[PDB]
């Protein structure tokens, strides 16, 4: 017998959005300089031919795939001119994000003790390193497959891919071949870039604040333990694990909405709910920023 | 000169060019499956690119040209397949899939207070197999087409702006009330969505649905008696329908086999019991509850 599945290339779509810039005044088409998209790591993506939707609105697309779950700054050099001859003496700047706006998904736990694999995968998929995880061949292939088809897979196909991925993760050295484990083991199998706060600073918060540039994910192994409110730079906090005692859940933020994902249960949460999350066993162990 | 930036990921076209996969129950001999056939819900054959074997059990191919959106497609593996155990297939094998989203639906705010009908109709139209024909029709206001294309991939703020523009352009149309509450059918008339009046020839709504022309997907239920969820025929292909609670419209839409109730901006997942409990008409008024039903 045969089973048919459809895998739409929507992730790659998220990597080549169609950006649109609307201006306060009518702009002269030939004043528009070359627009550059720039990332938090310094890399610049070029912008394709400009299409004018109105005397004020222009539309373009990155020349090359942008990174996933990454923030990008649109830089319009100085020199644009209005239809009245005015000029912009300053580079104009805006921003956007290559992340999904739809709500997170739930990953089943058919093992009974696969909480930690699911939580770690939830934190990784919402991670700025998802593209970097997906390119490392040393990573089990099935995990990469689950992480690329995450948002766009039938639940049935997501469930089969998850079974195969859990199988391949337990097959690794770092991860238990059976039974429960730790989020850190799965992240190490994923080759996720983390910043141990023991390296460096004296506490977790100071290492997060006084960390090298472009450090997004932190592993909190210093003292004191932190709660949600203690996490620095809340404006960029996008994911973090929470440990309820032999059970891991994920807290992941999408399009300004926080969600709590316990295996296959996605439930939306507000900031006040999060602020009640205590720190005591470490509660928050991995904190992922954008 | 200041700027406002928006990001619209090309998710709609992505759904129209999927990569299809067939997994088999047993290891298959690579040379036993030489040609697979893709066919559309109208029977037309769609051309397919090279066949790729990802494993002894899994094959992967891709449409040559964009498929239609929110549309069903049937895959046939011809007879002659052979397993590694010598077995053979005396009959052509068949499966199916649809180019529709698996993501959960979105919510549309109602700042008007009486724009329930616009939101409900747009929700039904976006889950329609005729979405491509609506988006290509120049007679439909351009803001509405933009909203219907950016439905799944737009920021909540950007979707809200698009919705304001779409409601504005809709109320301006002849079909739709310039102000105040209204009816789903007026929005469908503006969108020019193909509808099949069951009052037209048939004796019941359901019998008109069953004995309808081929490839009739959207129905306007204007015969007697009114139908409940259970009375609607062919539940297996039902993907959307409206529900009217008395001057207030909600939508019921199915995605990846899961039904959702969208009351303006409130998306809530529902089970079969909730639907089977939905009444067919109000006792005092006598008003039809479900009037538009959309199939795949």
Author numbering:
A (entry chain B): 194 to 393, 396 to 475, 481 to 490
B (entry chain A): 193 to 393, 396 to 490
Give excerpts from the publication.
The betaproteobacteria Burkholderia pseudomallei and Burkholderia mallei, causative agents of melioidosis and glanders, respectively, encode the TssM effector, the only known bacterial DUB belonging to the USP class. By solving the crystal structures of isolated TssM and its complex with ubiquitin, we found that TssM lacks the entire “Fingers” subdomain of the USP fold. Instead, the TssM family has evolved the functionally analog “Littlefinger” loop, which is located towards the end of the USP domain and recognizes different ubiquitin interfaces than those used by USPs. The structures revealed the presence of an N-terminal immunoglobulin-fold domain, which is able to form a strand-exchange dimer and might mediate TssM localization to the bacterial surface.
To better understand the evolutionary position of TssM within the USP family and its possible relationship with the Josephin family, we solved the crystal structure of TssM193–490 to a resolution of 3.15 Å. This construct comprises the portion of TssM predicted to be structured, and upon crystallization revealed the presence of two globular folds: an N-terminal immunoglobulin-like domain, followed by the catalytic DUB domain. The asymmetric unit contained two TssM molecules forming a possible dimer with a contact surface formed by the Ig-like domains, with some contributions by the catalytic domain. A single β-strand formed by the first eight residues of the Ig-like domain is swapped between the two adjacent dimers. The two chains are almost completely resolved, with the exception of residues 193 (chain B), 394, and 395 missing from both monomers, and residues 476–480 being disordered in chain B. Both chains have identical conformations and can be superimposed with an RMSD of 0.63 Å for 3,221 atoms. The DUB domain assumed a papain-like fold with an active site triad formed by Cys-308, His-442, and Asp-457. When matching the entire USP folds of TssM and USP7, the resulting RMSD of 5.4 Å is unusually high. This discrepancy is owed to the fact that the TssM structure lacks the entire Fingers subdomain, which is in accordance with the major deletion observed in the multiple sequence alignment within the respective region. In TssM, the entire deleted region is replaced by the short helix α6 flanked by flexible loops, which appear neither related to other USP domains, nor do they structurally correspond to canonical USP elements. Whereas the Ub-PA–bound structure contains two individual barely interacting TssM ∼ Ub-PA complexes, the apo structure shows the Ig-like domains in a strand-swapped dimer, in which the first β-strand of each Ig-like domain folds with the remainder of the adjacent molecule. The β-strand swap observed in the apo-structure does not appear to stabilize a TssM dimer in solution and might be a crystallization artifact.
